[PDB]
Design a protein around this motif. Structure first.
Motif, mmCIF file in Angstrom:
data_model
loop_
_atom_site.group_PDB
_atom_site.id
_atom_site.type_symbol
_atom_site.label_atom_id
_atom_site.label_comp_id
_atom_site.label_asym_id
_atom_site.label_seq_id
_atom_site.Cartn_x
_atom_site.Cartn_y
_atom_site.Cartn_z
ATOM 1 N N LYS A 27 0.773 -1.141 -0.047
ATOM 2 C CA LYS A 27 0.073 -0.042 0.083
ATOM 3 C C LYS A 27 0.790 1.175 0.203
ATOM 4 C CE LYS A 27 -1.075 -1.404 4.546
ATOM 5 N NZ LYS A 27 -1.995 -2.171 5.334
ATOM 6 N N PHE A 40 -4.282 -12.749 0.359
ATOM 7 C CA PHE A 40 -4.646 -11.722 1.336
ATOM 8 C C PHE A 40 -6.104 -11.384 1.253
ATOM 9 C CE2 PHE A 40 -3.887 -8.294 4.391
ATOM 10 C CZ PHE A 40 -4.709 -7.543 3.994
ATOM 11 N N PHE A 70 -3.283 -0.452 12.351
ATOM 12 C CA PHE A 70 -2.484 -1.080 11.058
ATOM 13 C C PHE A 70 -1.945 0.234 10.398
ATOM 14 C CE2 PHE A 70 -5.480 -4.695 10.242
ATOM 15 C CZ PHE A 70 -5.210 -5.464 11.210
ATOM 16 N N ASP A 88 -0.482 -10.543 14.283
ATOM 17 C CA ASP A 88 -1.885 -10.085 14.174
ATOM 18 C C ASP A 88 -2.589 -11.574 14.463
ATOM 19 O OD1 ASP A 88 -2.778 -7.422 12.998
ATOM 20 O OD2 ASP A 88 -0.836 -7.563 11.788
ATOM 21 N N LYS A 103 6.255 -6.015 7.649
ATOM 22 C CA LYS A 103 6.096 -4.765 7.087
ATOM 23 C C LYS A 103 7.418 -4.088 6.917
ATOM 24 C CE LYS A 103 2.156 -2.704 8.294
ATOM 25 N NZ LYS A 103 0.983 -2.243 9.126
#
Ligand SMILES: Cc1cnc(O)c(C)n1
Ligand SMILES: Cc1cnc(O)c(C)n1
Lengths: 218, 218
Positions: A27, A40, A70, A88, A103
């Motif tokens: 993203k 996902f 997030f 998570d 990430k």
């Protein structure tokens, strides 16, 4: 141009993500999705609906309640070269699961921080698989007893555990006595040996079960 | 061709990940590996690779055969495969998982394999600290060999037994016992045993106990 390469590289990376069983995606700096593979989108309720360009407050899954946090993670990756791993634990579209979401900052032949890449790994099954592999490389506990044993197996003493749980040392000593007797051990040292040999080092206290978290590992 | 445009894009990708990342072919000859990986293998700093797995300055090469075997049953599939690689890597013994997936590109042909190395000890410890934090709102800094020696001291073994089991001289093990003693502040061997036993050190398992060289798929 240079934008030519920055869009060739991004379509490269969707071809990359589309052929891994892991939930993969990237993203932007607004934490808005640019792509996410079918794994996902299937871990969230997005089985066949292909929705992209939205925020983490997605459709059809409880993950959205932590969408806010997030994106917070999504910015502390962006102000750094180093990657960050997120535990998570969520009621995903097919039950509760314990994922690791790694990430990383998104750099491209631009060199600019464009956003983040996230790699989700299902820890539930592979935890047991790697545990049996690693150990061949070599009773009904209550909730408080599970906590006491978790910290006993981790080098704490009865007074340390008394501190951690906010009870007196006698209370913790009584709990240790009942755990010991449930194991059939004759003393604390036999209890440690029995518990370590019966797989209890990998036990998670059941009071921790089915509560929704996302935490950066440190 | 477009698929080597994809290879250069993912070479940029792997070059900007902190994890050991790389790509090999159907002959398992290296196509690329980032600086993390070949610094984890002995080619820190030096060699671009067009090599096989045996051509590295690290003991991993002794298991090159079985690496290649893994590299062939991922390639006849789409799904991932996880391999527990416990090895004396270029910077000490480590417990890695190498998750290897087929190298597919905008041709669609099976060109080779991608491998993702993850240090399992570090992320395991991170998950344990996370679980401790969920259960809540004197670090003596023992070395690995000191952890092993103390583990066996608390279990009735003497210095020559430790020397035998660890393949070191009795005087080396005695020096280790002395330095553990001083780190604890103990006056003799038995006071060290008592102090360590009372401070929760009976429940520590040395990571050095897992230092047996394996690479096996789950
Ligand atoms: C389930 C989940 C958790 N954290 C994230 O960042 C994403 C994208 N998905
Ligand atoms: C240490 C190791 C194990 N398997 C592999 O495939 C590679 C590339 N490295």
């Amino acid at each position: 141009s240079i934008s030519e390469g920055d869009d060739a590289y991004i379509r490269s990376l969707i071809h990359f993500f589309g052929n891994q069983p892991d939930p993969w995606g990237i993203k932007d700096t607004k934490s808005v999705f640019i792509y996410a593979n079918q794994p996902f989108r299937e871990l969230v309720g997005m089985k066949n609906r292909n929705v992209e360009g939205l925020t983490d407050a997605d459709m059809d899954c409880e993950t959205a309640a932590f969408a806010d946090s997030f994106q917070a993670q999504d910015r502390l990756v962006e102000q750094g070269r180093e990657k960050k791993i997120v535990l998570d634990v969520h009621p995903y579209a097919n039950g509760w699961r314990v994922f690791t979401f790694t990430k990383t900052p998104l750099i491209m032949p631009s060199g600019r921080v464009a956003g983040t890449i996230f790699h989700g790994q299902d820890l539930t099954d592979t935890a047991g698989r790697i545990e049996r592999a690693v150990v061949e490389l070599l009773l009904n506990l209550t909730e408080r007893e599970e906590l006491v044993l978790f910290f006993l197996l981790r080098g704490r003493t009865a007074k340390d555990i008394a501190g951690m749980l906010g009870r007196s040392p006698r209370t913790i000593e009584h709990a240790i006595e009942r755990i010991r007797n449930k194991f059939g051990a004759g003393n604390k040292r036999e209890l440690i040996d029995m518990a370590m040999s019966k797989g209890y080092y990998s036990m998670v206290p059941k009071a921790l079960f089915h509560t929704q978290v996302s935490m950066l590992l440190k």
